[PDB]
């Protein structure tokens, strides 16, 4: 109960990385269709894809902090 | 770089000038043709053209219609039916026209006419953009 | 094909009216040249 | 002792021959031998140099040694089994410090507090928000460095499951083969789809990370 | 002076004729005119030329002939794709426009 | 030929240095390895033209 | 029962950050292809991206307010 | 059982806010990829964006009222 | 048992309302990009968007009825 | 256990209605952004939308009968 | 426990029908926005509509096979 | 407990096939939109659609492996 | 309590792969639709689809390592 609910509770918090996983494929997907429209690749466009993968893995890092709080 | 050819039958403003961008009132509305913008063919809308020329300039324009052409080649062709720098339009006229135009729309009664008035109205709008 | 290609409408038809509407717009100063620059001495026949 | 002790020397030696053989090709011979082996680092100096410099010649060969070392180390976890679940994991943990340290050498060693000052000052991290810089210091480093270990460890995992599901299919249907051959033939092809792909993308991570180092360098 | 020459089975095979474009110049205005109506007619592209006097230098012009094509369809084929952004609209509404441009132009030449 | 023989020896060593492998876990990975050959030889016939010539050129 | 179900129930509310993380990859991705058609980078487009991600991570901060209310 | 299941019953109803989280990113993201085609930003498009964000936080006003019913 | 798992059965039924919330944005967001091509606002597209809002919130009604079934 | 986990098993089967609800939003959205190109409203595009919302809620009737099997 | 978990396990695999029902909404959506581009309606596009809805319902028929196996 | 939680864990892993199912529709849908733009249907674009169904079913075979390991 | 909850912890941690598989379908779709507009296929763009299918599977190896941690 005390060692049980923290072992099944740390597993439910790992379903918060399904958002950052597909959220990283879209921000890197629209940059693939964006650089297809060309040509400001280096700087502007591909420099914003880092700003879009950072605000998406911020909820991932917030979810990976929760699953590690019930694991340690 | 992109070589911008800006002309009207009346005038050539730029002729394949190394402009970095021209943002176009194509019937797309726009697509702001970048030097790295896929070649593309466009019919021009009435709106404004802004010529971001690699020179710290964006130059202002209204074009009525025509076609713009983005070649594969570095050249972009604004072939503006009426091509103006916003510089020569008449604001006063626009408003005045616009009321009138709408009015006529109120009396427009062929699909075409309606279209036309509306066109006109719109025209005044697309002018109104600037104006 | 909406209202400048209406159902029909030449893009021309439109266009010319657009441009014409631009010509209508602007100042007068310029409009002297306008019709002048958009004559239509094109008299017409079929033959 | 011997089992671990034979593996790490072997991993070095397989990289050492290529790393000695190319230096050797700079005058002799070539016969079949040298010219055949020169192809190996021609494949490195062809394939990887298509992406490298890039960051400059300076760094290029420094990374290419690791790129070959990672792929060669995973290839020395490819053939072996069992190997993946224990030894390749101890090699993924033994590569974990090298992967962490690989960002250390130039990034964290020169700037631990903000190795994103070398990697990405404005991008992933908000430069207006030093909080997001430190936050994204894990998602650009602390987690990516653990994700890079995981990144080699799922190749390890995907490789392992091919062997394991693997084995679980002919252990299930120890018929010789027989119907296990059908699933087993799939599980095989999963070797390519899992290990050989993910193995690729694991060195692609090392490529990109050492690109983002040396592209901002 | 086109009518004039043409009578050579080209009194039936005129579709239209345009007239007195000199003696007080031609214009885009005109051009648009000739352009517009031209289209409408089940005559569109039937290949041919626009044969005009292309001015060349003071001392010279060379009378041109063109390919005249306006079928959006074979302007489906090829390069059309490549410089993308196309529709049997915009196609046409350039095809159109360039017909006008040329028509004007040529005329002015 | 010599290189191929060395790679085979390595695979064996590693198989033998383990707790317990199933007939299965091996055969799979063996057909995984096995599959690669047929493509590899057709590719290998091409392979040579690149690299030896690339030396000779450089 | 009173403390056990508070550790496995704060983990199920951490799956509500899956929308704030996948939504952030949609609010920035549709801004990458947005400035690709260009040209209003600073103001208008990127200004509307900030008012969109704030309305995307709001369902992440309120979901981490129902998470921390079950463990603290 | 009675008080124990009321804790892992409003936590599973808190993961319903993942639809409103990414739905607000899909709605506002389309408005950022719409005003880029221009120019009816003031009214018409951004005014319709307030009709789409309300109809997406409507499911957020019915899912957060569910978890707040199993609380007190 | 009878009173316990009925409370944890209504909560997971409220997670089925995460499709309607993200469905509401992807249906009223494609119409936010439809009028960007113009000009069928209050004509065809905005009329079908209500016929698209009804087909998606019904799959939220058929899911909230399961959540109300395991509550009364 | 027997007269308990089937009440929390019909809650998890009602989470399958997050695909029939978010699939309708994707379907009745592209038939709103596609009719914006015009002019195949009747007989073609909206007729295929009847066959688009037929294979969308087909995974939902199969998910509404799975929960109905864990109740009646 | 031995009889309880099969009921709770059948519903959990029925939540894997949320991916197949939205993957059919994306394939039939991008065919509804793939027929507006014209003109090969029969063959090519709508002939590959059933070929794209076969690999996407293949994840549902395998998931509803793991849900039925815990029931029979 | 030990012969129980294996059935309430192997079912939760089948909810990982939601990305494999909705990833197959998105990779094929944009292939149906990419072949609607023409013309390299035979290899190049639909050939890459096989290289997109493989890197999307790999995150569905690794998830089905963990579900099969907790059942047999 | 100790032997059971670790099986219902790696089961809910496999629901984090639901983003790595769908996000890969989003990036490989945007490279399938991106190469249609042409012409940088054997360079530039398809070399950015490998950098996208990795960052998406980066939350698919981080999530998979947690499910391999709760088991062994």
Swiss-Prot record, chain B:
Modified residues (N6-acetyllysine): 100, 129
Annotated Gene Ontology cellular component terms: mitochondrial envelope; mitochondrial inner membrane; mitochondrion; proton-transporting ATP synthase complex
N6-succinyllysine modifications at: 100, 129
Keyword Acetylation on entry: yes
Gene Ontology molecular function terms on file: proton transmembrane transporter activity; proton-transporting ATP synthase activity, rotational mechanism; structural molecule activity
Disulfide bridge positions per record: none
Keywords annotated in UniProt: Acetylation, ATP synthesis, CF(1), Hydrogen ion transport, Ion transport, Membrane, Mitochondrion, Mitochondrion inner membrane, Transit peptide, Transport
Record-level GO BP terms: aerobic respiration; mitochondrial proton-transporting ATP synthase complex assembly; proton motive force-driven ATP synthesis; proton motive force-driven mitochondrial ATP synthesis; proton transmembrane transport
Keyword Transit peptide: yes
Principal cellular location given in the protein's record: mitochondrion
Subcellular location as annotated: Mitochondrion; Mitochondrion inner membrane
Its job: Subunit delta, of the mitochondrial membrane ATP synthase complex (F(1)F(0) ATP synthase or Complex V) that produces ATP from ADP in the presence of a proton gradient across the membrane which is generated by electron transport complexes of the respiratory chain. ATP synthase complex consist of a soluble F(1) head domain - the catalytic core - and a membrane F(1) domain - the membrane proton channel. These two domains are linked by a central stalk rotating inside the F(1) region and a stationary peripheral stalk.
UniProt organism field: Bos taurus (Bovine)
Gene it is expressed from: ATP5F1D
From Swiss-Prot, chain C:
Pfam families xrefs: ATP-synt_Eps
Signal sequence coordinates: none
Keyword annotations from UniProtKB, A to Z: Acetylation, ATP synthesis, CF(1), Hydrogen ion transport, Ion transport, Membrane, Mitochondrion, Mitochondrion inner membrane, Transport
UniProt key word Glycoprotein: no
GO annotation (BP), single: proton motive force-driven mitochondrial ATP synthesis
InterPro entries: ATP_synth_F1_esu_mt (IPR006721), ATP_synth_F1_esu_sf_mt (IPR036742)
UniProt subcellular location: Mitochondrion; Mitochondrion inner membrane
Disulfide partners: none
Residues found modified as N6-acetyllysine: 20, 31, 36, 43
Described function: Subunit epsilon, of the mitochondrial membrane ATP synthase complex (F(1)F(0) ATP synthase or Complex V) that produces ATP from ADP in the presence of a proton gradient across the membrane which is generated by electron transport complexes of the respiratory chain. ATP synthase complex consist of a soluble F(1) head domain - the catalytic core - and a membrane F(1) domain - the membrane proton channel. These two domains are linked by a central stalk rotating inside the F(1) region and a stationary peripheral stalk.
Name under which the protein is recorded: ATP synthase F(1) complex subunit epsilon, mitochondrial
UniProtKB/Swiss-Prot annotation, chain D:
GO cellular component terms listed in the entry, alphabetical order: mitochondrial inner membrane; proton-transporting ATP synthase complex
Membrane topology: Multi-pass membrane protein
InterPro entries, per the entry: ATP_synth_F0_asu (IPR000568), ATP_synth_F0_asu_AS (IPR023011), ATP_synth_F0_asu_bact/mt (IPR045083), F0_ATP_A_sf (IPR035908)
GO molecular function terms attached to this record: proton channel activity; proton-transporting ATP synthase activity, rotational mechanism
PROSITE patterns with a match to the protein in the record: ATPASE_A
Superkingdom of this protein's organism: Eukaryota
UniProt-annotated location(s): Mitochondrion inner membrane
Keyword terms of this UniProt record: ATP synthesis, CF(0), Formylation, Hydrogen ion transport, Ion transport, Membrane, Mitochondrion, Mitochondrion inner membrane, Transmembrane, Transmembrane helix, Transport
Protein's GO biological process: proton motive force-driven ATP synthesis; proton motive force-driven mitochondrial ATP synthesis; proton transmembrane transport
Catalytic activities: H(+)(in) = H(+)(out)
TM regions (residue ranges): 1-20, 59-79, 88-108, 129-149, 155-175, 180-200
Subunit (UniProt): Component of the ATP synthase complex composed at least of ATP5F1A/subunit alpha, ATP5F1B/subunit beta, ATP5MC1/subunit c (homooctomer), MT-ATP6/subunit a, MT-ATP8/subunit 8, ATP5ME/subunit e, ATP5MF/subunit f, ATP5MG/subunit g, ATP5MK/subunit k, ATP5MJ/subunit j, ATP5F1C/subunit gamma, ATP5F1D/subunit delta, ATP5F1E/subunit epsilon, ATP5PF/subunit F6, ATP5PB/subunit b, ATP5PD/subunit d, ATP5PO/subunit OSCP.
Family: Belongs to the ATPase A chain family.
Protein's UniProt name: ATP synthase F(0) complex subunit a
Protein encoded by which gene: MT-ATP6
From Swiss-Prot, chain F:
Interval of the full protein contained in this chain: 76 to 133 of 256
Subcellular location per the Swiss-Prot or TrEMBL entry: Mitochondrion; Mitochondrion inner membrane
Family: Belongs to the eukaryotic ATPase B chain family.
Protein name: ATP synthase peripheral stalk subunit b, mitochondrial
Lineage: Eukaryota, Metazoa, Chordata, Craniata, Vertebrata
Domain of life: Eukaryota
Assembly description: Component of the ATP synthase complex composed at least of ATP5F1A/subunit alpha, ATP5F1B/subunit beta, ATP5MC1/subunit c (homooctomer), MT-ATP6/subunit a, MT-ATP8/subunit 8, ATP5ME/subunit e, ATP5MF/subunit f, ATP5MG/subunit g, ATP5MK/subunit k, ATP5MJ/subunit j, ATP5F1C/subunit gamma, ATP5F1D/subunit delta, ATP5F1E/subunit epsilon, ATP5PF/subunit F6, ATP5PB/subunit b, ATP5PD/subunit d, ATP5PO/subunit OSCP.
List of residues that carry N6-succinyllysine: 56
Organism: Bos taurus (Bovine)
Protein function: Subunit b, of the mitochondrial membrane ATP synthase complex (F(1)F(0) ATP synthase or Complex V) that produces ATP from ADP in the presence of a proton gradient across the membrane which is generated by electron transport complexes of the respiratory chain. ATP synthase complex consist of a soluble F(1) head domain - the catalytic core - and a membrane F(1) domain - the membrane proton channel. These two domains are linked by a central stalk rotating inside the F(1) region and a stationary peripheral stalk.
């Amino acid at each position: 109960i005390d060692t049980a609910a923290k072992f099944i509770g740390a597993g439910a918090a790992t379903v918060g990385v399904a958002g950052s996983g597909a959220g990283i494929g879209t921000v890197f997907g629209s940059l693939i269709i964006g650089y297809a429209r060309n040509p400001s690749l280096k700087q502007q466009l591909f420099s914003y894809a880092i700003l879009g993968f950072a605000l998406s893995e911020a909820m991932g890092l917030f979810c990976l902090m929760v699953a590690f709080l019930i694991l340690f | 770089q992109m070589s911008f050819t800006f002309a009207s039958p009346t005038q050539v403003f730029f002729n394949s000038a190394n402009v970095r961008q021209v943002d176009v009132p194509t019937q797309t509305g726009a697509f702001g043709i970048l030097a790295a913008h896929v070649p593309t063919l466009q019919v021009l809308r009435p709106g404004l053209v802004v010529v971001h020329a690699e020179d710290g300039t964006t130059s202002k324009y209204f074009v009525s219609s025509g076609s713009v052409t983005v070649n594969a080649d570095s050249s972009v062709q604004l072939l503006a039916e009426e091509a103006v720098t916003l510089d020569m339009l008449d604001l006063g006229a626009a408003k005045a026209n616009l009321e009138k135009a709408q009015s006529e729309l109120l009396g427009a009664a062929d699909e075409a006419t309606r279209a036309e008035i509306q066109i006109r109205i719109e025209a005044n709008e697309a002018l109104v953009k600037a104006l | 094909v909406a209202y400048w290609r209406q159902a029909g409408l030449s893009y021309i038809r439109y266009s010319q009216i657009c441009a014409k509407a631009v010509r209508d717009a602007l100042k007068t100063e310029f409009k002297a040249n306008a019709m002048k620059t958009s004559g239509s001495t094109i008299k017409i026949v079929k033959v | 002792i011997t089992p671990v002790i034979l593996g790490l020397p072997l991993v070095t030696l397989i990289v050492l021959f290529p790393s000695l053989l190319f230096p050797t090709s700079n005058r002799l011979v070539s016969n079949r031998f040298v010219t055949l082996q020169q192809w190996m680092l021609q494949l490195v100096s062809k394939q990887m140099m298509s992406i490298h410099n890039s960051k400059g010649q300076t760094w290029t060969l420094m990374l290419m040694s690791l790129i070959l070392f990672i792929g060669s180390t995973n290839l020395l976890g490819l053939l072996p089994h069992s190997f993946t679940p224990t030894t390749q994991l101890s090699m993924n943990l033994g590569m974990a410090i090298p992967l962490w340290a690989g960002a250390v050498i130039t990034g964290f060693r020169n700037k631990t507090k903000a190795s994103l000052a070398h990697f990405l000052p404005q991008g992933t991290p908000t430069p207006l928000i030093p909080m997001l810089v430190i936050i994204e210091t894990i998602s650009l480093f602390i987690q990516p460095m653990a994700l890079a270990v995981r990144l080699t460890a799922n190749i390890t995992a995907g490789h392992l499951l091919i062997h394991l599901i693997g084995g679980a299919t002919l252990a299930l249907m120890s018929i010789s083969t027989t119907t296990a051959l059908i699933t087993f033939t799939i599980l095989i092809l999963l070797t390519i789809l899992e290990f050989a792909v993910a193995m690729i993308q694991a060195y692609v991570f090392t490529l990109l990370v050492s690109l983002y180092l040396h592209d901002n360098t | 002076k086109i009518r004039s020459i043409l009578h050579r089975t080209h009194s039936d095979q005129f579709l239209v004729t345009f007239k007195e474009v000199g003696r007080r110049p031609p214009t885009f205005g005109d051009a648009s005119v000739i352009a517009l109506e031209l289209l409408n007619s089940g005559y569109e592209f039937d290949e041919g030329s626009i044969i005009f006097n292309r001015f060349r230098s003071v001392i010279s012009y060379k009378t041109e002939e063109k390919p005249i094509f306006s079928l959006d369809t074979i302007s489906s084929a090829e390069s059309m794709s490549i410089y993308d952004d196309i529709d049997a609209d915009v196609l046409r509404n350039y095809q159109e426009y360039s017909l006008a441009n040329i028509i004007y132009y040529s005329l002015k030449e | 030929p010599y290189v191929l023989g060395t790679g085979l020896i390595l695979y064996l060593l590693s198989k033998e240095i383990y707790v317990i492998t199933p007939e299965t876990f091996s055969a799979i990975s063996t057909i995984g390895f096995l599959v690669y050959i047929v493509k590899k030889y057709g590719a290998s016939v091409g392979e040579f033209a690149d690299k030896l010539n690339e030396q000779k050129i450089a």
